[PDB]
DNA sequence: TCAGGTAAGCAGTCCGCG
DNA sequence: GCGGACTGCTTAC
Ligand SMILES: Nc1ncnc2c1ncn2[C@H]1C[C@H](O)[C@@H](COP(=O)(O)OP(=O)(O)OP(=O)(O)O)O1
Ligand SMILES: [Ca+2]
Ligand SMILES: [Ca+2]
Ligand SMILES: [Ca+2]
């Protein structure tokens with residue numbers, strides 16, 4: 001087999017690499033890598049190395065990496081560019097793996113671990129590590145085993161061994177319900193003292209050294225805690241055994257308002273699953289506790305126990321250990337679904353970076369572009385310092401607030417990357433500038449044609465047309481991968497709808513789910529069998545379809561994020577190829593494209609309707625348009641349609657056969673106007689939206705920019721079994737809105753769009769009447785909490801104190817002296833509730849850590865003093881008032897002359 | 902919130918507005 | 920009471 005790296009490090013003048021050799025075995029080597037860097041040289045000097053602009057370079061081979069680094073410094077001292085890859089391990093990987101890497105995940109050791117630490121004096125600070133580690137569960141992907149290290153004897157209590165038999169029993173049997181499918185995979189090791197636990201753990205670690213290390217909050221908690229605890233007990237050298245090269249560094253993580261410390265373990269790639277989730281999931285959650293995320297992703301109930309976590313080991317060690325094991329399993333279950341580890345490995349090996357670098361698009365692209373250029377003996381420029389400067393972004397159309405009955409939407413496929421490819425935007429393809437006219441002049445095609453030679457953007461930039469830039473070349477490759485995965489995602493989605501339809505008529509039989517590949521549209525034969533399956537088999541198929549769709553979503557949206565990151569990287573001062581000429585070339589072209597095509601679509605539709613000056617495009621944002629289809633529907637007449645699906649077909653056909661050809665013609669003209677290299681503006685139909693046929697539903701509404709709701713029947717070719725709301729920006733979509741309020745507001749919107757005014761008024765009256773019974777957590781607002789210290793003045797709100805920060809200070813006074821009460825963590829999220837006049841907390845709100853119940857010693861007082869009226873008005877009524885006035889509707893029935901009877 | 906761009910919405914504070 | 924200047928937070932792209 002072809003070899004592949006596992007990890008790579010520079011330690012002094014040595015490269016330390018762990019790798020899989022040609023026989024599939026893990027090996028480690030130290031290599032005295034001699035790096036090369038480059039300097040510009042005279043034309044008369046024969047060379048095969050050229051910078052990206054075609055200027056000749058001489059290669060400078062160094063005795064060692066430190067010599068190379070010192071040379072860079074001296075070149076700065078002289079004032080001359082020092083060219084080439086200055087991150088020497090990336091150059092080492094490029095030299096060592098000079099081919100597309102084919103990796104085998106089954107040979108990569110993926111460790112997932114979680115530790116427990118009993119602490120009677122509050123949160124166990126990792127940097128102090130003053131409390132014993134009393135449990136470690138460590139799952140190894142190669143062994144497929146959960147290794148459990150259990151401390152029986154502690155200063156905080158002596159306990160009995162954990163029982164696997166009790167662990168397997170139902171909660172209703174007094175057991176822990178450790179899933180039966182992992183029971184046989186547990187390797188349980190009890191220890192009489194902490195020193196032997198940790199020594200054995202380190203020996204185990206040497207034997208089974210993680211390549212990828214993950215878990216929940218492992219980078220901020222588990223790793224620093226284990227490292228510091230071992231350091232405290234045994235000394236530094238023993239703690240450094242966590243690194244296979246015995247090298248570690250305390251790394252200071254700085255944010256806007258403070259810093260924290262993590263431990264870098266050389267020769268290990270730490271991918272904390274919380275950070276994987278935050279980057280790759282495209283959610284924003286009210287809380288990031290594992291119990292909250294597990295419930296969200298897997299629909300598993302919260303791990304329940306009595307009393308504080310600090311007394312759980314002494315009161316119920318059995319449950320203590322079981323929940324440690326389950327917590328490790330939950331992360332593995334999330335990953336089986338979301339496949340973020342597989343994503344990281346894919347992207348990492350593609351770019352030829354340290355796997356943990358997938359968190360940085362700048363580093364990822366720097367390595368992709370470097371490897372690409374290196375193949376052509378081209379030499380990358382030196383990174384430079386740039387002051388951060390603002391620059392212009394997308395255009396967003398100001399919509400007229402209103403109901404909109406029938407709507408078809410269209411938007412560009414991979415807009416910014418397609419602009420890059422079309423215009424040929426790259427560092428080395430810059431050809432010059434042209435004198436710019438107002439943007440309006442290009443939009444309306446009255447401005448002079450920018451160039452008869454070069455490919456142009458309306459920001460004034462011109463680009464070569466003879467060859468593709470390295471940015472268009474490399475972005476195309478990742479775009480093509482994205483497209484393949486999106487194909488699989490959409491097929492799984494369509495397949496899902498086939499199953500949902502069949503579930504309307506399940507068969508009374510005993511059978512199995514069909515063995516099918518959900519990434520491909522079901523054949524006629526599969527469809528026929530599905531129509532004969534039981535509800536049990538259908539639901540199992542639906543679950544598998546949806547898992548396939550999730551896998552496709554992960555693969556596609558994060559490849560989309562990567563290529564969109566390259567467009568963004570051109571406006572990031574840390575990027576090697578930072579250039580505001582190129583960043584603005586993209587964004588300004590985007591602004592032109594949207595407004596150009598708005599004009600074109602308006603012109604086309606006024607023509608087919610025999611009108612003049614009417615606006616069919618009601619809205620657009622960045623690369624999208626929303627077209628009113630009322631007149632198209634009315635041209636055939638609603639009476640002519642058999643059912644909803646009938647007019648959806650008609651609009652689908654109209655969009656595909658009339659709109660899209662018109663749109664394509666408009667963009668082809670724009671391509672030629674800008675003299676672009678290749679037409680790649682593909683604005684495909686997204687949504688077909690409208691009320692159910694014969695209903696009083698309003699179909700859709702806008703309140704303003706980035707705030708709208710549509711009742712959608714077909715989305716990018718997926719015809720829904722049931723209509724689905726596309727809601728953007730409104731309070732139902734914000735993590736700050738109370739959960740129960742999101743639900744109620746969503747139902748209000750559903751009723752508005754599908755059923756009409758009367759239905760809405762019915763639901764509002766009921767929600768208003770019953771909402772005080774809602775659980776306090778379900779009606780609490782949510783906010784991130786930054787700068788708590790800034791606004792704290794002797795425990796009281798300072799000037800300009802934010803409402804949520806005020807809440808935290810109220811909490812802090814109410815729990816003062818309690819070393820045990822949960823502390824609000826700076827930068828994390830809190831629930832927030834308003835408090836009625838004259839409450840014992842002495843202020844208008846209280847806040848507490850999100851994802852948790854408020855501590856018992858104030859809970860009853862919070863509940864008693866909760867201001868339900870203020871809560872209702874702020875989170876429910878005011879947004880609803882916004883929705884209904886926009887839609888020209890009333891949420892409360894107006895008096896009429898019929899009331900006289 | 903270490904990690905990737907800008908546009909733009911709403912909550913809330915402070916304070917003006919005769 | 921609303922709105923403008925401003926901060927904070929959170930979305931849509
Ligand atoms: N998370 C992001 N980071 C940077 N730029 C973004 C992001 N989301 C959107 N953009 C910019 C770049 C996109 O090309 C452009 C249009 O957004 P959007 O329509 O959501 O994606 P897209 O056009 O790239 O892909 P799709 O093919 O799924 O529509 O807005
Ligand atoms: Ca725990
Ligand atoms: Ca798009
Ligand atoms: Ca059937």
Ligand SMILES: [Ca+2]
Pocket residue numbers: 411412621622623624
């Ligand atoms: Ca879009």
Ligand SMILES: [Ca+2]
Pocket residue numbers: 411412413684685686716
């Ligand atoms: Ca599309």
